Amino acid sequence: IVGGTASVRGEWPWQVTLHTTSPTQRHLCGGSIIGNQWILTAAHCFYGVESPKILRVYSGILNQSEIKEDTSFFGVQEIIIHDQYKMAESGYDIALLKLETTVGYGDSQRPICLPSKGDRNVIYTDCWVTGWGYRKLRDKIQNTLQKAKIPLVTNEECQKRYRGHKITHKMICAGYREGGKDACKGDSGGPLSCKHNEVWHLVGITSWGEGCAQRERPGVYTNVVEYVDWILEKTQAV
Amino acid sequence: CTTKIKP
Ligand SMILES: NC[C@H]1CC[C@H](C(=O)N[C@@H](Cc2ccccc2)c2nc(-c3ccc(C(N)=O)cc3)c[nH]2)CC1
Question: Do the Cβ atoms of B5 and A115 come within 8 Å?
Answer without folding.
Answer: no
